[PDB]
Structures are given as structure tokens and as C-alpha cells.
Symmetry: C2
Subunit: 120 residues, 2 copies
């Protein structure tokens, strides 16, 4: 239940996700708040029976940066964990891969981190 | 991709089977140990469904949560990479494996590695 909803990073991005009962994540990622030309499909998975033990819940998702306005020839994956409660957060690291020639394949993949919370 | 749809093998004994939807969806199954049915997990992801015309790879990514009816590892792995078609077709990836952790152990939460998938067993 706790994952379903809207989340915001610290830079102006948003997503909206629904967590299905058997582990599915589906939704939309908006790279710039309030901009509908910046919406992309998100698909992923989560562990649908995490540990009672005060641990986070592991999850991941992908966005391919193609919609009817933009085709960046790239995709990003986020890997992380949801921690519920009053300061709920999804703490992630991400990999962004761009389609490249074989000669440029070594500069194909950027890495970073994102922390999502439930307020802007 | 006609090209992406099908079965892929890493160099360590894992396999997956994927279907690439016409509007960017990846769906399928990941088997961590070849011909072990208790080792099958749902895979979902995305690819860029209109890659460049010009011998560039096709970007894609997917997630497996390591839970099925036999195992719950309390973890999920994401792969990010690119498909390169042709004679020696490959999907070259880097992966992130995150485990659910306590807050004290959160800095030990995420493993990183790489995987190269081909269309024939290693
Ligand atoms: Cl589900
Ligand atoms: Cl599709």
C-alpha cells in the first residue's frame, strides 16, 4: 500500500506508481513538474512480502526516455528500497544507458542517486 | 525489436526469456540457474522502440524482484544496457542489486556488477 502514490525527488521530478498485489510496479515518470510533454511510462517490480523487521522493501523500475515528444535513445533504471512511516522515502541509485556505437560503448552508462519523498 | 525478443544467456548460467512489445514494453522471465524451474522470476522493463538508424545499440532496462513461490530474497536487481543485433548479437549491461535493509545497514544495501548476454549458451 505504502509505495502506491506520487513521489518527488529533490530536483523537480515526479512519478506516480501503483504497486500491484503480486509485485508489479506500473506508472508514469515526469522529468519536469507540471510538464505533460515530459511524461514517460515506468514499469518495475518490488518484493511484495518484505521483512517485518524494520527493513526497507526492495524495488526497482525502468523508464525508456521515449514518448510522443522526445526520443532520447536512452533508458534509466532505478534500484532501491522503500522505507515507510512519517518521513517515508524511496532511496535509490540509478543507471542511465544511452544507445551508442561500438566505439563509444565505454561512455554508454551514467550513474547517480535519487531520494524520493512524498512531499515536493 | 524482433531482435530483442527471445532467450538470452549470460556467461554464468543464467537465462532469460523476453518479449519486446511494439510500444516499448519488456516482459518475461529470468531463471538464475539453467533448467531449474524453482529459480524462475518475473522480469519487466522498457526499451527504446525507435532506436537510431545507424549501427548504434538500442537502450533498454529491466527489473527482477527475487521473489517467487520458492524463494524470497528480499531484494531486487535492475539491469541497464543496450542491445546490439547481428551476427554476434549481445545485450551488454550493468546491474544494481538492492537488498531491503535496516537504516543502520543501508550503506551496505546495493551491489553493482556487469553482465553480457548472448543468444547461445556460454
Ligand atoms: Cl501485481
Ligand atoms: Cl508495448
Amino acid at each position: 500500500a505504502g509505495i502506491t502514490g506520487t513521489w518527488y525527488n529533490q530536483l523537480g521530478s515526479t512519478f506516480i506508481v501503483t504497486a500491484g498485489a503480486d509485485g508489479a510496479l506500473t506508472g508514469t515518470y515526469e522529468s519536469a513538474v507540471g510538464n505533460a510533454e515530459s511524461r514517460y511510462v515506468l514499469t518495475g517490480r518490488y518484493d511484495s512480502a518484505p521483512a517485518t523487521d524494520g527493513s526497507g522493501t526492495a524495488l526497482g523500475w525502468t523508464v525508456a526516455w521515449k514518448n510522443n515528444y522526445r526520443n532520447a535513445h536512452s533508458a534509466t533504471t532505478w534500484s532501491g528500497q522503500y522505507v515507510g512511516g512519517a518521513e517515508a522515502r524511496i532511496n535509490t541509485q540509478w543507471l542511465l544507458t544511452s544507445g551508442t556505437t561500438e566505439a563509444n560503448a565505454x561512455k554508454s552508462t551514467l550513474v547517480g542517486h535519487d531520494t524520493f519523498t512524498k512531499v515536493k
